[PDB]
Each structure stands twice: as C-alpha cells, then as structure tokens.
C-alpha cells in the first residue's frame, strides 16, 4: 500500500450558467459571448473541489 503514486489530475471548469448552452446530444458548450470573453477553452481553477 505504500506504493500509491499519482497518475494524473482532472480538469474542472467553473461556468456561471448564463453563458453555457446545451448541445443536441446532452453536452454543454460555451456560447459566443462566453468564448469571446473567456477564450476558446476554459482554464481549470483550483477553487473547485470535488
């Protein structure tokens, strides 16, 4: 048991909810304003806890 080793880290994003639109398959994506103001892809923030 003393050989546990990290093998990666998830990417969590924080979207307010007024700038995300559902796709046609159940997934959510940034809208035009959201991607314009926060870049093409969001950056993971350490404040998110799971």
């Amino acid at each position: 048991p003393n050989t546990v080793a990290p093998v990666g880290r998830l990417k969590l994003v924080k979207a307010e909810g007024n700038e995300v639109q559902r796709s046609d398959d159940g997934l959510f994506r940034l809208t035009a304003e959201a991607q314009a103001e926060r870049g093409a892809v969001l950056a993971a923030d350490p404040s998110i806890r799971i």
């Binding site: 048991p1 003393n2 546990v4 990290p6």
Partner: protein, 260 residues
C-alpha cells in the same frame, strides 16, 4: 442480509467454541496425564472503502482510510504441556514420567502412538500392556512367579524371582521426545500420533538429553486449574449474552425497515 448479522453470528460461534473447549477441560479433570487446552482467536478480513495514505490533495494524504471489519474466527488451540501434580497409588505397575517425553505404544494396525498416562497392566501372555490392550513398543515381557517389579529412575525394569538373591533385568523403558510437544495430534485414548508439525521422534533413555525420570508408584494428574475455568465460564456467558443483544438490535432495526 446485513453485515452486522453476519459479524454477530461469527462472534456467537467463537464464544460457543470457547465454551466448548472450557467444558472439555472441565470434564476430564480426573484423567491422568491430561493437558488443558486454550483457544486463540484472530479476526477475519477487512473491507477497505478509502485507501489509507492515498492523496487528498497535491501535498496532503489521508491519515487513515475507512476500513470495516468482518468478524472473528478461532485459529488454533494450544495444549499447556506443563508438569502436572503427582499422586501416589502404591501400585507397583503405575509409573509417572517427571519432565519431558512419552511412552511409545504399538497400535493394533501396526502404527505407533505416544502416551503420558502411566498405568500398566500385565495380560495373560506376560506383555506389559496399557489399560486398553495396546502393548508398550519395547516389548517388556514379565515372567511368571514374579514376586515384585522394580523400575529404576533410568527406566530399567527388573523382577524379583523366588531365589537367586538378585533381580534379573527383563527389559528397558525408552522415552521419545519431540521438537514441538504442542504439535502432536490426539486421537482420544490418552494417545497422541506424530504429525508434520511435531518433529520426527527420537528415542532416548530417561535422564539424558533433557528427558524426564521415572517414578514407580505415582501417576501424573491433569494440569487443569478450575479456579480459572470458573471465571472463564462467567466471561464466556457474558460475551454470549452481549452478542445475542447485538443480534436482537439488528433484528429490531431490520423489522423497523420492513414496516417502512
């Protein structure tokens, strides 16, 4: 269907086994050369929900993860191969071994057992058999018209005939010692059979290589201490009652869930 029921069942079974060995010790307190038994317990496996020491952040780790038990299981029983007390019988054919070792006994099928209960009788052929008909392996043959039988400390047996003004040797007693006394398997006639745990037997005359001496006219009593057995019985009863209480509590909560 609840883990608590399964755990409490194992607890009750362990207490039952302990009470069983206590009662077995209490039964033959009058058996010559009987050794008490003690049961040792050991818990079962564990279910790990959260692995201890796993990372909880980039730098912190869980000091101790979630880990649930599964119950208890008896693992072994040990015979207290101590020295029992010696009682006098004034019977010339009763021999008590003081120290370590066993008398070898030739079973009817041809195998060999080992006994510490020294109470010998002579059958119609002159053989020095044990109580039960099995004869001692070195084949001591007592001749007729024997006034008395003398067995020395070094296990040399001689008889006093009508004349000759000197006893004549008729055989010798040899004692076998084992590496692990507690390892022998008992078969239920004050007899133990050699098994893999105990080493190979090696005969030795009394008084050599740590083997005990022989006293004629004495018999070794069982080393059972009833003063401890009574307290053990009290503790066993209380533990059984507590486990039954746990079973009852689990049943009550299951019934309440059913009524939901």
């Amino acid at each position: 269907m609840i883990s608590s029921l399964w755990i409490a069942k194992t607890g009750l079974d362990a207490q039952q086994t302990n009470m069983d060995v206590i009662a077995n010790n209490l039964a033959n307190v009058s058996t010559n050369g009987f050794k008490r038994q003690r049961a040792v317990f050991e818990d079962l496996l564990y279910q790990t929900i959260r692995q201890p020491g796993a990372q909880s952040s980039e730098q912190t780790t869980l000091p101790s993860g979630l880990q649930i038990g599964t119950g208890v299981r008896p693992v072994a029983t040990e015979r207290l191969h101590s020295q029992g007390n010696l009682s006098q019988t004034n019977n010339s054919k009763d021999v008590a071994i003081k120290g370590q070792g066993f008398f070898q006994v030739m079973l009817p099928d041809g195998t060999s057992a080992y006994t510490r209960d020294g109470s010998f009788q002579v059958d119609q052929n002159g053989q020095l058999v044990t109580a039960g008909g099995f004869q001692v392996q070195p084949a001591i043959t007592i001749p007729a018209n024997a006034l008395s039988i003398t067995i020395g400390r070094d296990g040399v047996v001689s008889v006093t005939q009508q004349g000759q003004a000197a006893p004549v040797q008729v055989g010798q007693l040899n004692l076998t010692t084992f590496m692990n006394d507690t390892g022998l398997e008992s078969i239920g006639e004050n007899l133990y059979i050699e098994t893999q745990s105990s080493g190979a037997p090696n005969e030795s005359t009394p008084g050599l290589n740590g083997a005990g001496l022989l006293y004629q006219g004495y018999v070794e009593t069982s080393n059972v201490n009833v003063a401890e057995e009574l307290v053990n019985m009290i503790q066993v009863q209380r533990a059984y009652e507590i486990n039954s209480k746990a079973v009852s509590t689990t049943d009550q909560m299951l019934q309440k869930l059913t009524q939901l």
